[PDB]
Ligand binder design. Structure first.
Ligand code: BCL
Ligand code: BCL
Ligand SMILES: CC[C@H]1c2cc3[nH]c4c(c3C)C(=O)[C@H](C(=O)OC)c4c3nc(cc4[nH]c(cc(n2)[C@@H]1C)c(C(C)=O)c4C)[C@@H](C)[C@@H]3CCC(=O)OC/C=C(\C)CCC[C@H](C)CCC[C@H](C)CCCC(C)C
Ligand SMILES: CC[C@H]1c2cc3[nH]c4c(c3C)C(=O)[C@H](C(=O)OC)c4c3nc(cc4[nH]c(cc(n2)[C@@H]1C)c(C(C)=O)c4C)[C@@H](C)[C@@H]3CCC(=O)OC/C=C(\C)CCC[C@H](C)CCC[C@H](C)CCCC(C)C
Ligand SMILES: COC(C)(C)C(=O)/C=C/C(C)=C/C=C/C(C)=C/C=C/C(C)=C/C=C/C=C(C)/C=C/C=C(\C)CC/C=C(/C)CCC=C(C)C
Ligand SMILES: COC(C)(C)C(=O)/C=C/C(C)=C/C=C/C(C)=C/C=C/C(C)=C/C=C/C=C(C)/C=C/C=C(\C)CC/C=C(\C)CCC=C(C)C
Ligand SMILES: COC(C)(C)C(=O)/C=C/C(C)=C/C=C/C(C)=C/C=C/C(C)=C/C=C/C=C(C)/C=C/C=C(\C)CC/C=C(\C)CCC=C(C)C
Ligand SMILES: COC(C)(C)C(=O)/C=C/C(C)=C/C=C/C(C)=C/C=C/C(C)=C/C=C/C=C(C)/C=C/C=C(\C)CC/C=C(\C)CCC=C(C)C
Ligand SMILES: COC(C)(C)C(=O)/C=C/C(C)=C/C=C/C(C)=C/C=C/C(C)=C/C=C/C=C(C)/C=C/C=C(\C)CC/C=C(\C)CCC=C(C)C
Ligand SMILES: COC(C)(C)C(=O)/C=C/C(C)=C/C=C/C(C)=C/C=C/C(C)=C/C=C\C=C(C)\C=C\C=C(/C)CC/C=C(/C)CCC=C(C)C
Ligand SMILES: COC(C)(C)C(=O)/C=C/C(C)=C/C=C/C(C)=C/C=C/C(C)=C\C=C\C=C(C)\C=C\C=C(\C)CC/C=C(\C)CCC=C(C)C
Ligand SMILES: COC(C)(C)C(=O)\C=C/C(C)=C/C=C/C(C)=C/C=C/C(C)=C/C=C\C=C(C)\C=C\C=C(\C)CC/C=C(/C)CCC=C(C)C
Ligand SMILES: [Fe+3]
Lengths: 51, 274, 44, 52, 102, 52, 43, 325, 51, 44, 51, 40, 51, 51, 43
C-alpha cells in the first residue's frame, strides 16, 4: 500500500515510455511464439477447421 | 639521444607494472615491463622463424614458410617440425603484439595523452587474433591459420578466398574493402589539404584552417573540419580492421557454402515477381 | 555508525562480472561445447 | 536390349526402374515415348558403367 | 563446386589453376567427367530427346532438349548418393554385353 | 538528444520484431533481417525527424 | 525524499491513476486469457 | 572514463560560413545556399556549405550523368524495361565492354558500342572534375596536392579502361560498368593472367594500401590522443609547434624509434595514398602487355613457395572419415 | 477514469506522431500477415473463387 | 498540479475528451470491419 | 532482520533498474529453457494432450 | 547524493513488502506447476 | 580465528557488491553445466521418470 | 621464519585482490581442465555408473 | 492550447477546407472502388 513512493524515484515520462514499448514488444513476442507453434496458430486452425 | 624538446617529457612514472625497475629508455625507444616482454617475445619469435627456416632448407625471405600443423592434429600441440613451431611463434607473436599495445599504454600514460593509439592497434591485433586463433578455434584445428611466409601466406589468402567460390561476394568483405579504398581516399585528401595549405605557390602566404575548410566546401560542397577528419578517419580505418575481421570469421564458422549463394536471399524474395 | 567517505562501489563489481563472464563462457564451451562445429577436410 | 535377361531378373529390374523413374507404367506400351526413351537410356546407363 | 558441394580448393590449388602438378587427384576425375558429360549430352541425351520428347518437356527459349551436367548425378554431394554402391546388385546396368553375375 | 536515441532504439526494436515476424510467416532470417534493417532505418529515421 | 521532483501527494495521485490503468489492462487480459482457455486450453 | 574525442558532446551553430575570398572572386560561382545537419555534426562539421559550381564542375556533373544515364538506360532496357526486375538485378546488371572480336574498332551499340560512348562521357566527366580540383586550388592560392593526388587515382582509372585496352589492342580489356560485374572482372583478371597476388606491383600497391589504412588509423588516433592539446589544429601546430606536436612526436619516437613533424606526417600520408594506384597502374599496365602469367613469373624469378606435402584429400583423411561414418 | 492526466506527462505532439506511425505499421503488418496465410489471403481466394 | 508538457488540468481534460472521441470512432469502425470479416471468414 | 543499512550505500535509481531488468531476463531465460525441453514445453504438450 | 537513515528506513520496508508479494506469487506458481507437472 | 580484520584493508561496501556478482555468475554457471550433462539435467530426468 | 616482512614490501590491499583473482581463476581453470578430459569428468562418470 | 501559434478560429477554418478535400478524395475512391468491384470483384 506504500508502493506509491516508486514515482519519487523514477521519472514518470521515462518509465511510461519504457513500459509502453516493453508491453507491446512482450505482447507481440508472445503472439509470434503462438503463431510458431502448430497448435496455437489460429490462422492455420481456421484453414484446417474449414477444410 | 633526445630531441630538442624531449627532456621535459622524460619523467618518472606512468607505468602499469614494474615501476622504476624497467622505467628507462634505450636509445629513443622506451623500455617498460612490456618493453622487456616485447623484446623477449619478438626476439624468440624471430629466431624460431629462422630456426625453422634453417631446417626448411632455405633462408630466402620469399621462400621461408612456417606452416601450421595438419587439420588432423586438431587443437592439440603438434611436433615442432610438423607444425608445432608455428604454434609457438603464434604464442610469441600474440605475446609480442599484446605487449606492444600495452607498452604504448605506458608511453601515452607518461605523456598524458589519450589511449586512442593502443586501442586502434588492438583492432589490428584483433584482426590478427581472429585470423590465427579465433577462427581456428571455431573450425576445430590450428591448421586453419595462415602460414608465416612472405609469399606463403598469400597462397593461404588465395585458397581461403576461393574456398567459398567467389570471395568478392562476401557481404562483409564488400563493407571492409569499401573502408580500405575510402580510408586511402580520406588519407590522400586529408594529407593533400594540410600540404596544400601549408605549402602554397611560391611567394604567397600560407593558409589557415579556414582556407582548407572552404576548399572542399567549394570542391565537394561540404567540409568535415580539421577535428572531424581525424574522428571519421580513425573510425574509417577501425571499421576497415573490424569488418575485415568479420568477413573471415564468418567464412567457414558461419558460412560454408559459396559466397555468391549467400545473396540468394535477395534474389528469391517473395516480393519479386516470377 | 557508518562511513560517509566517497567510494566507487561498482568498480570491482564490473571487472568481476567480466572475468567471471570469461569463465562463464569457457565453462559453457566445455560443458555443451562448440554449438556449430563446422569440421573441415584437408585437401592440400 | 533387355530381352536376354532371365524372367526373375527382368521383373526385378523393370520394377526397379519404375520406382527409380517414378513412372508406374514404364515399359508397358512399347510405342510410348517414355518407354522408347527408357530403352535407349538403358543402353546409356550401361555405357556409363562400362565405358566411363 | 556447387554440383559437387565442394569448393574450388577441392580440385585446384588457388595459386595455380593451370598447373597439373598442383591439382588433387579429384581434378583428374573431374576432367574425365567433362568428357563423359559431353559424350552423354551430344550422343545419348540430345538425340533421344529430339525424337521422342513432347513439346512440354522442351526448353522455354530455344525449345531445346534438356541436358545433363555434373549436378544431374551428384545433386550437391561429393559423390552421387554419397558413394553408395548402386551397381553391385545391378549387373544388368553395369555392362553392354550381357550381365555378368558370376 | 534523449529523444532521437529513443526513437532510434524504438526503430531497432521494431526491426527485430519485423525480423522474427517474417520468419514465423515463412520467409528467411536474411530476408527478414533486411526488412528489419529497412524498418529500423525508415521507421527510426522517420521518427527521428517527425518527433523530436 | 524525492528524486525526480514529484511531491509525496503528487505521486499518490499519480499512483492511483496508474494502478487503475494497470487493473483495467489486467482486467481485459484476464478476460482475454479466460476466453482463450475455453477456446484452446493449454493445460 | 576520460572523454574520448569521438563524438562532440555539445554543438554550437552560428551564421553560415560562406568561405574566404580574394581577387579571383570565388563568390560569383558559389551557390550561397547553406544548410546545417546536426546528425553529421556529432562527428564532424555540421554545415552543408555552398558549393562552387564552375564550368569544370558543371561539365563533369552533366557528362557524368550522361554516363550514368546511358549505363542505366541500357541496364533498364537489358531487362526489358521491367522496373521490378531492374531493381532485383541492379547489382548484377552492367554495361559489358565490347566483344574481343572487334579489337579497337567501334563495336555495335548492343555489343559494347554504347559502352564506348558511355566511357567517353565518363572520361570527360572525370578529367573535368580533376580540372576543377586544379582550378580551385589555383584560385584559392594553395598548393595543388589535391589535384596531384587525384591524378594518381586517375592514373589507375585511365590504365584500367583507356591505356591498357589501347596497348592490348582491344576495347574488351575494359572494366564492365556493374556492381558485381567489375568484381567478376577483378576475379577473372587475376585468374586469366596467372595469379595477381604474385604481381610485385600488386603486392607493392597492397603495401601502400595497407600502409594508408595503417597510417591514417595511426594519424587519426594520435591526433585524437593529442587533441586535448589542440592537436586537431594541425596548421597552427606547423607554424608554431605546441605540446601537441611534441607529445605526438615523442609518443612515436619512444614507441618505434622515430617520428615525424605535424607537417611531415601529411607527406607520409600523401605519398602512401598516392603510391597505391601508381603502383597498381603499373602492375595492371604490365599485365597482359608484358607478362600474361604472374605465378610462372614468380617461379621464373624464384619467389613462389614450393610445397612438399601431398595435394589430395585422400592423403589426409577418408570420405567416410570426414562424413563421420 | 481520470486518465486525462497522461497528457501532463506525454507531449500531445510527440505521442500523436508516435501513435500515428505505430497504428499504420501495426495495420500494415497485420494485413501483410493475413496475406502470408493461405486461408485469409483475399487476393488468392478471389482467384480460386472465380474458378 | 504537475505538468511536464505545460498543459493545465483544464487543457488536458479537454484534449482527452477529443482524443477519446477520436478513439471510439476509430474503434467503432474497427469493430464493424472486424464483424464483417468474421462473417466472411471466421478465425475462431 | 532489519538490513536497511545496505540502502544507504546504494543509489535506488540504479539498483531498481538493474534488478528489474535482471528479474525479467532471469524469468525469460527460465521460460525459454523450459520450452527447449520436450517434457515441460506446455505448447507441445498441449498439442499432444488434444491429439 | 546518498540517503539518510530515515529515507532508507521506509525504502527497505517497501522493498521487503514487494519482496514478499513477488515471492508469494512465485511460491504459489511453483506449487501449481509441481502439481500440474512435477520435476522430482 | 581473527579474520575480522580483512575489512581493515578491504572495503566492505565494494566487497559486498563484488561478491554478489561473483556468486550469481557462479550459480548461473554451475546450473547451466548440469543442464549440459545427460545425468543431472533434471528437466530430462522428469521425462525419463514419467516414462 | 621471518616471512612476515613481505607486507613491509607488498601492499596488503593490493596483493589480496591479486591473490583472490588468481586463486579463483586457477581453481576455475583446473576444474574446467578435468571436465575437458574423459577420466576425471564426475558428470560423465556418474552417468556411466547409472548404466 | 496552440502549439503551432495558430488561432482556434483559423483551425476551424483550416479543418473545414481539409475535410471538404478529404471527402472529395474519398468520394473519388468510393467511385473508383465501385468500378473495380464491378469489373473484378474481390469478395
Ligand atoms: C582469392 C582472394 C580473395 C580474398 C580473400 C581474402 C581472404 C582470405 C582474406 C581477405 C582479407 C582482406 N581482404 Mg580480401 N580477397 C580478395 C580480394 C580483395 C581485394 C581486391 C581489390 O580485390 C581487396 C581490397 C581485399 C581486401 C581485404 C581486406 C578486407 C582484408 C585484408 C586484411 C586486413 O584487413 O588486415 C587485417 C590484418 C592485420 C591488421 C595484421 C595485424 C598486424 C599485427 C598486429 C602487427 C604485425 C606486426 C608484424 C610483426 C610486423 C612487425 C615487423 C617490423 C618490426 C615492422 N580483398 C580476393 C577475392 N580477403 C583478409 C582479412 O580479412 O583478414 C582479417 C582475409 O583473411
Ligand atoms: C581475385 C582478386 C585478385 C585481385 C585483383 C586485383 C585487380 C584486378 C586489381 C587489384 C588492385 C588492387 N588490389 Mg588486388 N586482387 C586480389 C587480392 C587483393 C587483396 C587481398 C587481401 O587479398 C588486397 C588487399 C588487394 C588490394 C588491392 C589494392 C592495393 C589495389 C587497388 C588500388 C586502388 O586503390 O584502387 C582504387 C582505384 C580506383 C577505384 C579507380 C580510380 C577511380 C576513379 C579515379 C574515380 C572515378 C569515380 C567514378 C567517376 C564514380 C564517381 C561516383 C561518385 C559517386 C560521384 N588485392 C586478388 C589477387 N587487385 C588494382 C591494382 O592492380 O592496382 C595496381 C586492380 O586493378
Ligand atoms: C586499424 C587497423 C590497421 C592497423 C592499425 C595499427 N597498426 C599498428 C598500430 C595501429 C593503430 C600501432 O600503433 C602499431 C605501430 O607502432 O605501428 C607503427 C601498429 C603495427 N602494426 C604493424 C604492421 C601492420 N599493420 C597492418 C594493418 C593494420 N594495422 C590495419 C590496416 C598490417 C597488415 C595489413 O598486415 C601490418 C603488417 C607494425 C608496424 C606495428 C606492430 C609492431 C609490433 O607488433 O611490434 C612487436 C613485434 C615485433 C617487433 C616483431 C614480432 C615478431 C613475431 C614474434 C614473429 C612473427 C609473427 C608474425 C605473424 C610474422 C608473420 C610474417 C608473414 C605473414 C610474412
Ligand atoms: C587510390 C587512393 C584513393 C583514391 C584517391 C582519390 N580519389 C579522388 C581524389 C583522390 C585523391 C580526389 O581528389 C577526388 C575527389 O573529388 O574526391 C572527393 C576523387 C574521387 N574519386 C572518387 C571515388 C572513388 N575513389 C576510389 C578509390 C580511391 N581513389 C582510393 C580509396 C574509388 C574506387 C574504389 O574505385 C572510387 C569510385 C570520386 C568520389 C571522386 C571524383 C569522381 C567524380 O566526381 O567524377 C565526376 C563524376 C561526377 C560528378 C558524377 C558521377 C556520376 C553520378 C553518380 C551521376 C548522377 C546521379 C544522380 C542520381 C543524378 C541523376 C539524374 C537523372 C535522373 C536525370
Ligand atoms: C460491356 O462493358 C462493360 C461491362 C460496361 C465494361 O466495359 C466494364 C468496365 C468497367 C466497370 C469499368 C471498370 C473500370 C473502373 C471503375 C475504372 C476505375 C476507376 C478509377 C481508378 C478512377 C480514377 C480516378 C482517380 C483519380 C483521377 C484521382 C485523382 C486523385 C486526385 C488527383 C487526388 C490527389 C491530389 C491531391 C492534391 C491530394 C493530396 C493532398 C494534399 C497534398 C494536401
Ligand atoms: C518466451 O517466454 C514466454 C513464456 C513467452 C515469456 O516471456 C513469458 C513472459 C514474461 C516473463 C513476461 C513477464 C511479464 C510481466 C513482468 C508483466 C509486466 C506487465 C505489467 C506490470 C503491466 C503494466 C501495466 C501498466 C499499465 C498498462 C498501466 C496503465 C496506465 C494508465 C494508462 C494510466 C496512466 C496515467 C496516469 C498515471 C496519469 C498521471 C497522473 C498524474 C499526473 C497525477
Ligand atoms: C504478429 O502478431 C500479431 C498477432 C499480428 C500481433 O503482433 C498482435 C498485435 C497486437 C495485439 C497489438 C496491440 C494493439 C493495440 C494496443 C492497439 C492500440 C491502439 C489504440 C490505442 C488505438 C488508438 C486510437 C485512437 C485514435 C487514433 C484516435 C484518434 C484521435 C483523433 C485524431 C483526435 C485527436 C485530436 C485531438 C485530441 C485534438 C486536440 C485537443 C485540444 C487542443 C483540446
Ligand atoms: C536454466 O537456468 C537456471 C537453472 C534456472 C538458473 O540459471 C538458476 C537461476 C539462478 C541461480 C538465479 C537465482 C536467482 C536469484 C538469487 C534471484 C533472487 C530474486 C530476488 C531478490 C527477487 C527480487 C524481487 C524484487 C522485487 C520484485 C521487489 C519489489 C519491490 C519493488 C522494487 C518496489 C520497491 C519500491 C518502493 C518501496 C518505493 C520507493 C521507496 C522510497 C522512495 C522511500
Ligand atoms: C493488403 O494491405 C496492404 C496493401 C498491405 C496495406 O498496407 C493496407 C493499407 C493500409 C492499412 C493503409 C490504411 C489506410 C489509411 C489510414 C488511409 C488514410 C487515408 C486518409 C486519412 C485520407 C486523407 C485524405 C486527406 C485529403 C486527401 C485531404 C485533402 C485536403 C484538401 C486538399 C485540403 C488541403 C488544404 C487546403 C486547400 C487549405 C487549408 C488551409 C486553410 C483554410 C488556411
Ligand atoms: C622452453 O624450454 C622448456 C624446456 C620448455 C623450458 O621450460 C625451459 C625453461 C627455462 C630455461 C626456465 C629456467 C628457469 C629459471 C632461470 C628460473 C629460476 C628461478 C628463480 C630465480 C626463482 C627463485 C625463486 C624465487 C623465490 C620463489 C623467492 C622467494 C622469495 C621469498 C618470498 C622471500 C621474500 C620475502 C621477504 C619477507 C623479503 C624481506 C623483506 C624485507 C626485509 C623488508
Ligand atoms: C482440471 O485440470 C487442471 C487442474 C486444470 C490441470 O490440468 C492442471 C493444471 C494446473 C494446476 C495449472 C497449473 C498452473 C500454472 C502452470 C500456472 C503458473 C502460473 C503461476 C505460478 C503464477 C503466474 C502468475 C503470474 C503473474 C500474474 C505474476 C504477477 C507478477 C507481476 C507481473 C508483477 C511483476 C513486476 C513487478 C513486481 C514490478 C517491480 C518493479 C521494479 C523492480 C522497478
Ligand atoms: C534511375 O536512373 C536511371 C537513369 C534509370 C538509372 O538507371 C541510373 C543509372 C544506374 C543504376 C546505373 C548504375 C551504374 C553502375 C553500377 C555502374 C558502376 C560502375 C563501375 C563499377 C565502374 C567500373 C570501373 C570502370 C572503369 C574502371 C572505367 C574506366 C574507363 C574509363 C571511362 C576510361 C575511358 C574509356 C574509354 C573507352 C574512352 C572512350 C573514348 C573515346 C573512344 C574517344
Ligand atoms: Fe592531420
Amino acid at each position: 500500500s506504500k508502493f506509491y513512493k516508486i514515482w519519487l524515484i523514477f521519472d514518470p515520462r521515462r518509465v511510461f515510455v519504457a513500459q509502453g514499448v516493453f508491453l507491446f514488444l512482450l505482447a507481440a513476442m508472445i503472439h509470434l511464439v503462438l503463431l510458431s507453434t502448430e497448435h496455437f496458430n489460429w490462422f492455420e486452425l481456421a484453414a484446417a477447421n474449414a477444410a | 639521444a633526445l630531441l630538442s624538446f624531449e627532456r621535459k617529457y622524460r619523467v618518472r612514472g606512468g607505468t602499469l607494472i614494474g615501476g622504476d625497475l624497467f622505467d628507462f629508455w634505450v636509445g629513443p625507444f622506451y623500455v617498460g615491463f612490456f618493453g622487456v616482454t616485447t623484446a623477449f617475445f619478438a626476439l624468440l619469435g624471430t629466431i624460431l622463424i629462422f630456426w625453422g627456416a634453417s631446417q626448411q632448407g632455405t633462408f630466402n625471405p620469399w621462400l621461408i614458410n612456417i606452416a601450421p600443423p595438419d587439420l588432423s592434429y586438431g587443437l592439440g600441440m603438434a611436433p615442432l617440425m610438423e607444425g608445432g613451431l608455428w604454434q609457438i611463434i603464434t604464442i610469441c607473436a600474440i605475446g609480442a603484439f599484446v605487449s606492444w599495445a600495452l607498452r604504448e599504454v605506458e608511453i601515452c600514460r607518461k605523456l598524458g595523452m589519450g589511449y586512442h593509439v593502443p586501442f586502434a592497434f588492438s583492432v589490428a591485433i584483433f584482426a590478427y587474433v581472429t585470423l590465427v586463433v579465433f577462427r581456428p578455434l571455431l573450425m576445430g584445428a590450428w591448421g586453419h591459420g595462415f602460414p608465416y611466409g612472405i609469399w606463403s601466406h598469400l597462397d593461404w589468402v588465395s585458397n581461403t578466398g576461393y574456398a567459398y567460390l567467389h570471395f568478392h561476394y562476401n557481404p562483409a568483405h564488400m563493407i571492409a574493402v569499401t573502408f580500405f579504398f575510402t580510408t586511402t581516399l580520406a588519407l590522400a585528401l586529408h594529407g593533400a589539404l594540410v600540404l596544400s595549405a601549408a605549402n602554397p605557390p611560391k611567394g604567397e602566404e600560407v593558409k589557415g584552417p579556414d582556407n582548407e575548410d572552404t576548399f572542399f566546401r567549394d570542391f565537394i560542397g561540404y567540409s568535415i573540419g580539421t577535428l572531424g577528419i581525424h574522428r571519421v578517419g580513425l573510425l574509417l580505418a577501425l571499421n576497415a580492421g573490424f569488418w575485415s575481421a568479420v568477413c573471415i570469421i564468418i567464412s567457414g564458422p558461419v558460412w560454408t557454402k559459396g559466397w555468391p549463394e549467400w545473396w540468394n536471399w535477395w534474389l528469391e524474395m517473395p516480393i519479386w515477381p516470377s | 555508525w557508518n562511513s560517509k567517505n566517497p567510494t566507487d562501489i561498482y568498480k570491482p563489481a564490473i571487472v568481476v562480472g567480466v572475468a567471471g563472464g570469461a569463465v562463464f563462457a569457457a565453462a559453457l564451451l566445455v560443458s555443451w561445447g562448440q554449438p556449430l562445429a563446422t569440421d573441415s577436410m584437408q585437401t592440400g | 536390349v533387355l530381352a536376354d535377361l532371365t524372367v526373375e531378373n527382368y521383373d526385378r529390374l523393370l520394377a526397379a526402374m519404375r520406382s527409380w523413374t517414378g513412372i508406374p507404367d514404364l515399359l508397358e506400351d512399347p510405342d510410348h515415348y517414355q518407354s522408347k526413351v527408357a530403352i535407349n537410356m538403358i543402353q546409356m546407363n550401361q555405357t556409363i558403367n562400362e565405358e566411363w | 563446386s556447387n554440383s559437387l558441394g565442394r569448393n574450388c580448393v577441392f580440385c585446384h590449388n588457388s595459386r595455380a589453376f593451370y598447373d597439373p602438378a598442383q591439382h588433387t587427384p579429384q581434378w583428374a576425375t573431374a576432367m574425365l567427367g567433362i568428357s563423359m558429360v559431353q559424350e552423354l549430352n551430344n550422343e545419348w541425351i540430345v538425340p533421344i530427346g529430339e525424337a521422342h520428347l513432347p513439346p512440354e518437356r522442351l526448353g522455354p527459349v530455344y525449345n531445346d532438349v534438356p541436358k545433363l551436367a555434373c549436378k544431374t548425378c551428384h545433386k550437391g554431394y561429393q559423390q552421387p548418393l554419397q558413394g553408395l554402391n548402386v551397381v553391385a546388385d545391378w549387373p544388368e546396368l553395369a555392362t553392354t554385353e550381357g550381365p555378368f553375375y558370376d | 538528444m534523449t529523444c532521437t536515441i529513443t526513437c532510434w532504439g524504438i526503430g531497432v526494436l521494431l526491426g527485430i520484431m519485423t525480423t522474427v515476424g517474417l520468419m514465423v510467416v515463412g520467409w528467411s532470417f536474411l530476408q527478414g533481417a533486411f526488412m528489419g534493417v529497412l524498418a529500423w532505418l525508415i521507421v527510426g529515421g522517420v521518427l527521428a525527424v517527425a518527433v523530436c | 525524499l524525492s528524486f525526480t521532483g514529484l511531491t509525496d501527494e503528487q505521486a499518490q495521485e499519480l499512483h492511483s491513476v496508474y494502478m487503475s490503468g494497470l487493473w483495467l489492462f489486467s482486467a481485459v487480459a484476464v478476460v482475454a486469457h479466460l476466453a482463450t482457455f475455453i477456446w484452446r486450453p493449454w493445460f | 572514463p576520460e572523454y574520448q574525442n569521438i563524438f562532440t558532446q555539445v554543438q554550437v551553430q552560428g551564421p553560415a560560413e560562406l568561405g574566404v575570398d580574394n581577387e579571383n572572386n570565388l563568390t560569383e560561382e558559389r551557390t550561397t545556399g547553406t544548410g546545417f545537419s546536426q546528425l553529421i555534426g556529432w562527428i564532424g562539421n555540421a554545415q552543408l556549405g555552398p558549393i562552387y559550381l564552375g564550368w569544370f564542375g558543371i561539365i563533369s556533373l552533366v557528362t557524368g550523368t550522361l554516363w550514368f544515364n546511358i549505363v542505366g538506360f541500357n541496364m533498364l532496357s537489358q531487362v526489358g524495361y521491367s522496373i521490378p526486375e531492374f531493381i532485383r538485378q541492379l547489382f548484377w546488371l552492367a554495361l559489358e565492354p565490347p566483344s574481343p572480336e572487334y579489337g579497337l574498332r567501334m563495336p555495335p551499340l548492343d555489343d559494347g558500342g554504347w559502352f564506348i560512348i558511355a566511357s567517353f562521357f565518363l572520361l570527360v566527366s572525370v578529367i573535368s572534375w580533376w580540372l576543377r580540383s586544379y582550378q580551385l586550388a589555383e584560385m584559392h592560392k594553395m598548393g595543388k596536392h589535391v589535384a596531384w593526388a587525384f591524378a594518381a587515382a586517375i592514373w589507375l582509372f585511365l590504365v584500367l579502361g583507356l591505356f591498357r585496352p589501347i596497348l592490348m589492342g582491344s576495347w574488351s580489356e575494359a572494366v564492365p560498368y556493374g556492381i558485381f560485374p567489375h568484381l567478376d572482372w577483378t576475379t577473372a583478371f587475376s585468374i586469366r593472367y596467372g595469379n595477381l597476388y604474385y604481381n610485385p606491383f600488386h603486392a607493392l600497391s597492397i603495401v601502400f594500401l595497407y600502409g594508408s589504412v595503417l597510417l591514417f588509423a595511426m594519424h587519426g588516433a594520435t591526433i585524437l590522443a593529442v587533441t586535448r592539446f589542440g592537436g586537431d589544429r594541425e596548421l597552427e601546430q606547423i607554424y608554431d609547434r605546441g605540446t601537441a606536436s611534441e607529445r605526438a612526436g615523442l609518443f612515436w619516437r619512444w614507441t618505434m624509434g622515430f617520428n615525424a613533424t605535424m607537417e611531415g606526417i601529411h607527406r607520409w600520408a600523401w605519398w602512401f595514398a598516392v603510391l597505391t594506384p601508381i603502383t597498381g597502374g603499373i602492375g595492371i599496365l604490365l599485365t597482359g602487355t608484358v607478362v600474361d602469367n604472374w605465378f610462372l613469373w614468380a617461379v621464373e624469378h624464384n619467389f613462389a613457395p614450393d610445397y612438399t606435402q601431398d595435394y589430395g584429400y585422400e592423403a589426409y583423411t577418408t570420405y567416410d572419415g570426414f562424413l563421420g561414418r
